[PDB]
């Protein structure tokens, strides 16, 4: 189930999956049917994947709790209305379906996807094992990044793969891509936040579907930290007090070094750590942000 | 197989489909395998891509050469491996149409590990044959400017206003497109279409050039649309469709314009005329 550092804010649930169920380990709901993830197949005529005509969001489940399911459905449905996608289901129906996908999977730790496409409009929901852009150890102890020399954004998951390969060839774990106008764009599968003089900044691109950075901004807010979506300059990145990766697939990752240069002392920054540890604490704290899945 | 108007330039091949083939009526090719259309499914996890749309009419596939050139050119951008060559995709494409037994077919090539999907299904109409011949009604939406979100909203406003279709403007008050088509206007024996996955428009411009009609890709203003002599829709799914009225007011004499009719009748004749553009399909 992936090992996590002992005594760390990151711990998997302790429990037994009954694999006699064909649903164990991954459930996808397609066309009114809950089916094992392995057998979940979508028509080639779905003009969503065929012609990028879809809305989607990604959620997560941790310790049997699904995080901010309501906010995810509002965001998915908002997107549905802008694209004139009528799912045919209500918010409550989509909620019960998402929760049943997780329940039938038996996963206490799960990566969840909700998609609405133009098929007659189609809804696809899946719950599969929890996904890491960075392993648990790196979430705790921090990772290493470079700015690619051989790929920029404009001011394409191909760029992101190349950026990642170049990082690994230069002996770092990940890339922070810049754009044409020398502003921070993003990482392969994450957004970047910088901390400078107790303020937090993240690019305005908002490519990622998830709600993790919104949670980071709200956590920063409740910590008295000014947090802003805006253009982040090359200068701001290389002069940042802290840099962090933010994504649904692993949460908040300290970035210890950029182009082999330590950021602060070359260890996770104090604001990165406070936000990260709060994020994981939220997964066990009764309140509006979580619902327990019934297994 | 969809009725067409009697005596019109639009007539389906006359033939019976052998449904003893599981491939009859529509076929998909997915990474090595030919499948009945209905069986053409991919993993949800598999669900960055380029694609082109083409058509077959009277057993002839239209401009597959130029479609494949367009498709591969697109593949190098987005860093997507072709996996196969042009001659190979060409064979696979003609084989899908052949196996489908469809003389009239809508065909799609997509490149998205690399995945290549090809299919041939029954021919798709943006506008029914009756409107391809007798023309249709349009409005400029007041609540949507220039995403199938916009074009679906345009379409909803058009129907709400009693019209068959919408012609969207951009924030610059220039003509963008309709839902599923490019707009061409005729003014003073000149053809114009807005400077914005089908070779149907390029085909209209080459037909227009060959009739001694200037044709320009440029900015068309709202005022040029309302003042046009003729308005037509252009798309792979149905070809060239006259627009007889705009905001309830007839364009011209309230019937298909003569350039529209000339270009339209020439496009349908291209399918039946042997040459570089059309290749007969071995069924």
Numbering used by the authors:
A (entry chain A): 19 to 137, 151 to 186, 198 to 337
B (entry chain B): 19 to 65, 71 to 135, 151 to 184, 198 to 247, 251 to 337
Question: Which passages does the manuscript contain on this structure?
Answer:
A mutant M9 with significantly enhanced activity and thermostability has been successfully obtained and crystallized for structural resolution. The obtained mutant M9, incorporating nine mutation sites, exhibited a remarkable 16.4-fold increase in specific activity and an impressive 208-fold improvement in thermostability compared to WT. These findings indicated that the proline substitution at position 105 could enhance the rigidity of the loop region, consequently reducing the flexibility of its neighboring α-helices.
The transaminase MvTA demonstrates transaminate activity toward d-fructose 1, and the resulting 2-amino-2-deoxy-mannitol (ADM) 2 undergoes dehydrogenation under the enzyme GutB1 and spontaneously cyclizes to produce the valuable azasugar mannojirimycin (MJ), which serves as a precursor for 1-DNJ. The dimeric enzyme exhibited the characteristic structural architecture of class IV PLP-dependent enzymes, consisting of two subunits.
